Amino acid sequence: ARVTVQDAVEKIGNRFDLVLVAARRARQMQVGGKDPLVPEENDKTTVIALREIEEGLINNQILDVRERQEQQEQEAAELQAVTAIAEGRR
Amino acid sequence: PEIGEEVIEIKAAARDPGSRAKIAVKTNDKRIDPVGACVGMRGARVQAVSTELGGERIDIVLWDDNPAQFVINAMAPADVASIVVDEDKHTMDIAVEAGNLAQAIGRNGQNVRLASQLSGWELNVMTVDDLQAKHQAEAHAAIDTFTKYLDIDEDFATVLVEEGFSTLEELAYVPMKELLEIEGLDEPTVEALRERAKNALATIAQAQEESLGDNKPADDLLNLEGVDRDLAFKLAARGVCTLEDLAEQGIDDLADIEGLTDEKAGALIMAARNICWFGDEA
């Protein structure tokens, strides 16, 4: 439903970095899927991330830091599993 | 290999995988250490079998001929200060603190059921201070029971029921001559015990009264097809009196009475409320 990404280019000046950000976002979207942050219209993943860019709530920093917290949560799952190992045997 | 040759016998083996497991073994008249032979060096057999099972906590225990010593050895590994047993019913009771009760019981009773599968009898766990409190309460209750069911004086009844096992509940079969060794006379106590037996018969009549006069089911519930008198009584025990009252009652309200099941609470009730409602139509 979108034909231009010039607003996105306005939000983030470097076009190629925008391409990388959108590619990483949609890669997370397809496999290991996460919910969209915009009501889509039976559209493909290629445009919904661009829609997320349109709202400006997405950049390199947001995804990087969000992935950092998600990695920390996965590590917290690892630690709770480790604590559940000690009690199970002893 | 000693099981076939009867050098050592596997008395019992109970295994909850991963949580806890107990194997109790005894020598089949060979004067050999069964646990030391079946465990190997530091449990190298039991530990290998547990590693085959994937991390089971296996405990090797001894076993004896008599069931009391069998249960005492099946309560391993722990220390026992005192143990109470019953000569009539094969039951055993031991006391331990909460820190030891948690280990001897287990999360889901895996160790305890391991003892239960070893001795074959039900087990009860209580604390030592709880044991003393229960002993005092049991002394008082046994004094009351000896006063009520044998119809004697309370001061002598307490001392008699202290020593008497199964203080007063059909205890005439047990030797009551041991109470005659105490001081005092009990010549009319025989007639008093006969009167107490008559009172027990009156209690049976009171149970019949609870069956009959205490909110008997109506003809509509009793004459319903597919439901018996006990089923109708169980359906009506949930506060219902009419067909509308039976429809208003639920499965949870009827679950208080053990005679009624969820299927008995299923749709109308199961068949009885439907029959009572549709008796107007042929």
Extract the tokens encoding A75: 């590590």
Q: How many CA atoms lie within 13 A of B48 on its CB side?
A: 8
Quick check: helix, strand or coil at residue B34? helix
Quick check: helix, strand or coil at residue B104? helix
- B279 CB near a chain A CB, below 8 Å? no
- A13 CB near a chain B CB, below 8 Å? no
Extract the tokens encoding B109: 């009773």
The CA radius of gyration of chain A, in Å to the nearest whole number, is: 18
Which residues from B are below 8 Å from A89, CB to CB? 55, 57
**Residue spans per domain, chain A:** 1-89
Q: Which fold has domain A1-89?
A: Eukaryotic RPB6 RNA polymerase subunit (3.90.940)
Rounded alpha-carbon distances, angstroms, from residue B239 to A22, B232, B243, B256, B265: 67, 12, 12, 10, 13
Rounded alpha-carbon distances, angstroms, from residue B244 to B92, B241, B259: 51, 8, 21
Selected residues 244-273 of chain B with any CB under 8 Å from a CB in chain A: none
Extract the tokens encoding B115: 């003892």
C-alpha B127/C-alpha B121 separation (Å) is 20
Quickly count: other Cβ atoms within 10 Å of residue B156's Cβ: 18
Q: Taking Cα atoms as reference points, which of B68, B125, B65, B118 lies closest to residue B91?
A: B68
Residue of A nearest to B50 (CA): A89
- B57 CB near a chain A CB, below 8 Å? yes
Asked if residues B12 and B117 have their Cβ atoms less than 8 Å apart, the reply is yes
C-alpha B258/C-alpha B253 separation (Å) is 11
C-alpha A55/C-alpha B20 separation (Å) is 57
- A84 CB near a chain B CB, below 8 Å? no
Quick check: helix, strand or coil at residue B215? coil
Asked if residues B34 and B61 have their Cβ atoms less than 8 Å apart, the reply is no
**Structure-token match 């979108």, residue found:** A2
Selected residues 22-51 of chain A with any CB under 8 Å from a CB in chain B: none
B172 DSSP 8-state letter: T
Q: Taking Cα atoms as reference points, which of B184, B192, B183 lies closest to residue B152?
A: B192
Work out the minimum CA distance from B49 to partner chain A, whole angstroms.
Answer: 15
Work out the minimum CA distance from B75 to partner chain A, whole angstroms.
Answer: 19
Residue of B nearest to A88 (CA): B19
Which residues from A are below 8 Å from B51, CB to CB? none
As a whole number of Å, the end-to-end CA separation of chain A is: 59
Method for this entry: cryo-EM
- B55 CB near a chain A CB, below 8 Å? yes
Measured in angstroms, the resolution is: 4.2
C-alpha B282/C-alpha B278 separation (Å) is 8
Helix ranges, chain B (H): 34-39, 44-53, 67-74, 98-105, 110-119, 128-149, 154-163, 189-212, 219-222, 229-236, 243-248, 251-254, 272-278
C-alpha B7/C-alpha B30 separation (Å) is 5
Interacting residues of A30 by C-beta distance below 8 A, sequence separation 6+: A45
Q: Taking Cα atoms as reference points, which of B181, B204, B264, B255 lies closest to residue B228?
A: B264
